[PDB]
Design a protein around this ligand. Structure first.
Ligand code: AKG
Ligand code: AKG
Ligand code: CL
Ligand code: CL
Ligand code: FE
Ligand code: FE
Lengths: 318, 318
């Protein structure tokens, strides 16, 4: 790239925990992502419960598509691997491609509320590294928005939010028939997590968030402590706005068996009460890790999971 | 000591972040502490503002004595140094004696509310080590209580509370004449810190806290992530109940210039508005560190502060 720009990127990420990277993908790569995800999406039937659970059972998710791991690591490296070098440099970390998600919003919807990636990076240790590349597949303009807002970690160091979220999950799991409807129990529980409403976030952050326009080819890179949300899409430009998101960890990132257990139990409890049948795309990263854990782990590191170890070269820089 | 007991102590601290240590001081040491603190206390005139600020300006402190560093490090090592070995072993850390406090409560007062030592260990980095020895100078019984309650870090990992508190301090410091009375501004600000009320703590913790009886000679040892509070003293046993508290850090504990600055600014702002004159006992640890910082620091470590480095032997195990 420019070199001068690359240094500004590194600089900005070091200050904020994020950076918008303009023109990182070529239009041809975008079109390939669009078509491929469009095909993958037509094939499977997906529900709102796994994104709801991921953000703690709060049920304020207003998104159209919430699909995890529709495509595999190989399709992803095929356009991401050549970029890992720039990201490794920006973060001073060695990145491995892991899991992905597709989100979309229709006009006049809130999409996802303010969050940090405690749901996305649930099966990994809080203090270990995690970051995301958010690739919008429909243009984000000043006039129609529909993109994201995001807050410098200088303003909102999101690492503390993980404990708060774990305390809340722990409460979820203490639910009882006596309690009444599970979802209402979770949403009204007097947990610290529930106290942190949008007004509170607003008062905390003020105007310190940033919202940027994106042309196809641009992406947003951010670590898992960055507080962020979807912005509503105004009608008249896109019927729907999609974004494809790649989750990356560090070579040394470790599994967190304890949170993984909390999520499973909560998921289990929710499916049992609501009589639902959670579907996971074959080769979903979460499923793969749960099995390795259920068998018992030899190593703490994600890299030493058998499927990962075998496919490691494709997951990392050349 | 017993050896079998010492292993239970180590075990318990590893689980909970705390342990009650029975009969660690002899009655003679206690009487010496009583007399010495009684003398030191008669001499100086102390206000409620520095404990109020330390817990974020909330003004729910209901204690009689809130005095910091009434005595010096040498008087403290004279009864503490011989115990550092047991504490170093329990925590697997090398402890340095640093600063101290005297708290007392009259019958039917709430003393201090639930807190973690973000006020006590304000000038040190969050992730660096801090712990306290709480030495009650008046007997704590099942019938009159007046002691403390405390929560396992397994139940409430208090490290997250430090960020929450720092976000709140940052808000304190954005106060304006336009805002109105500073204390009311701080107490009503819609900060995450203010959302975490007693009801919320109660809902989070449940009955998971522990309250123990203490005879003179017993003490409570706890790290700075442990959530704890004063319990009311029922009348008819003591006119007043005192406790002397020693704060310890690790040999490798570092100064946090940023929080130190926040506290100073907030303190400054509060004194300016209320026309108050903060007094600090000569050789207060906070004052000593502020000067070293204001001069500019050569090293990040507390040990490398000049006064500390000179007096290091007395601060550490033999
Ligand atoms: O695409 C969106 O609106 C939200 C995406 C998101 O939260 C993420 O990629 O982590
Ligand atoms: O003595 C009391 O009631 C409270 C003491 C306290 O909070 C401490 O020693 O950290
Ligand atoms: Cl996320
Ligand atoms: Cl404390
Ligand atoms: Fe997200
Ligand atoms: Fe305390």
């Amino acid at each position: 790239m420019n070199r001068e720009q690359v240094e500004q990127l590194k600089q900005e990420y070091e200050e904020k925990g994020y950076c918008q990277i303009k023109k990182i993908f070529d239009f041809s790569a975008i079109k390939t992502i669009q078509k491929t995800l469009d095909q993958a999406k037509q094939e499977s039937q997906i529900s709102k419960e796994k994104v709801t659970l991921k953000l703690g059972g709060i049920d304020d998710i207003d998104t159209n598509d919430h699909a995890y791991d529709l495509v595999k690591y190989d399709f992803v490296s095929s356009f991401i691997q050549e970029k890992l070098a720039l990201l490794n440099y920006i973060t001073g970390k060695n990145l491995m491609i892991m899991h992905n998600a597709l989100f979309s919003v229709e006009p006049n919807h809130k999409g996802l509320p303010w969050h940090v990636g405690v749901g996305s990076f649930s099966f990994t240790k809080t203090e270990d590294f995690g970051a995301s590349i958010w690739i919008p597949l429909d243009k984000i303009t000043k006039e129609h928005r529909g993109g994201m807002q995001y807050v410098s970690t200088k303003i909102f160091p999101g690492q503390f939010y993980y404990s708060v979220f774990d305390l809340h999950l722990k409460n979820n799991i203490k639910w009882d028939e006596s309690q009444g409807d599970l979802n209402e129990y979770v949403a009204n529980a007097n947990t610290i997590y529930n106290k942190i409403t949008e007004d509170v976030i607003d008062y905390t952050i003020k105007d310190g968030y940033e919202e940027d326009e994106y042309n196809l080819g641009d992406a947003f890179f951010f670590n898992k402590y960055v507080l962020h949300q979807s912005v509503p899409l105004k009608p008249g430009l896109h019927k729907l706005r999609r974004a494809f998101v790649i989750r990356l960890v560090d070579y040394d990132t470790r599994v967190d068996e304890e949170r993984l257990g909390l999520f499973s139990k909560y998921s289990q409890l929710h499916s049992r009460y609501y009589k639902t049948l959670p579907r996971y795309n074959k080769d979903s990263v979460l499923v793969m890790v749960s099995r390795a854990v259920q068998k018992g782990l030899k190593s703490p590191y994600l890299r030493d999971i058998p499927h990962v170890q075998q496919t490691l070269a494709a997951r990392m820089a050349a």
